[PDB]
Design an enzyme around this catalytic site. Sequence first.
Site, PDB file in Angstrom:
ATOM      1  N   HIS A  60       9.174  -1.095   5.674  1.00 14.97           N
ATOM      2  CA  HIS A  60       8.334  -0.071   6.291  1.00 14.97           C
ATOM      3  C   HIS A  60       8.905   0.289   7.662  1.00 14.97           C
ATOM      4  O   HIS A  60       8.987  -0.561   8.546  1.00 14.97           O
ATOM      5  CB  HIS A  60       6.875  -0.527   6.409  1.00 14.97           C
ATOM      6  CG  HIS A  60       5.976   0.486   7.049  1.00 14.97           C
ATOM      7  ND1 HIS A  60       6.050   1.830   6.757  1.00 14.97           N
ATOM      8  CD2 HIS A  60       4.988   0.352   7.962  1.00 14.97           C
ATOM      9  CE1 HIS A  60       5.145   2.481   7.463  1.00 14.97           C
ATOM     10  NE2 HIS A  60       4.487   1.608   8.202  1.00 14.97           N
ATOM     11  N   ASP A  76       3.514   3.939  14.074  1.00 14.56           N
ATOM     12  CA  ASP A  76       3.602   3.753  12.640  1.00 14.56           C
ATOM     13  C   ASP A  76       2.932   4.947  12.000  1.00 14.56           C
ATOM     14  O   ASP A  76       1.792   5.260  12.347  1.00 14.56           O
ATOM     15  CB  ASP A  76       2.877   2.484  12.242  1.00 14.56           C
ATOM     16  CG  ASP A  76       3.157   2.077  10.816  1.00 14.56           C
ATOM     17  OD1 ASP A  76       3.502   2.949   9.992  1.00 14.56           O
ATOM     18  OD2 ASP A  76       3.039   0.874  10.512  1.00 14.56           O
ATOM     19  N   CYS A 114      -2.545   5.611  -3.697  1.00  9.86           N
ATOM     20  CA  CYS A 114      -1.968   4.441  -4.358  1.00  9.86           C
ATOM     21  C   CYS A 114      -3.007   3.650  -5.119  1.00  9.86           C
ATOM     22  O   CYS A 114      -2.781   3.238  -6.254  1.00  9.86           O
ATOM     23  CB  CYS A 114      -1.329   3.509  -3.329  1.00  9.86           C
ATOM     24  SG  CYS A 114       0.186   4.121  -2.602  1.00  9.86           S
TER      25      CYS A 114
END
Length: 152
Positions: A60, A76, A114
């Site tokens: 990530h 992030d 997801c």
Amino acid sequence: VEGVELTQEGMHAIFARMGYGDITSGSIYNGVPTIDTGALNRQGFMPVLTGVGPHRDSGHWIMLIKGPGNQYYLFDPLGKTSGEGYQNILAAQLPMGSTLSVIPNGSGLNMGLCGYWVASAGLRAHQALNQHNPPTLLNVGQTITNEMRNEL
């Protein structure tokens, strides 16, 4: 033709297109931060590849930012979770009196999809390969990949 990834060293590639030169990266690999220290202070930004290990082959990507005085920031592109999750680890590698604040952004891609697909296409897989007189594993992943980027 196929793609997924996170990219990788094409991270340094997209940076160099923006000028800035070729940048020193950082990592957390199997839980070990490689990010240090003053090269960041002169650069102003790392960026860091997280979530990677001997097992996990992609990662990530996040960004370390240096602010004024003792301030440092974490970007992030999600944004609450993920980067409050790297906070305590990454903030340890900065100089003593430094503070690491996580940018309050709202995540990009909307990861909620997801969990939908784990339900939707995940038991649709059970609805398919287990059991029946079933298609192949390649065939099921190919169905699902098409199905997953279809709805969007």
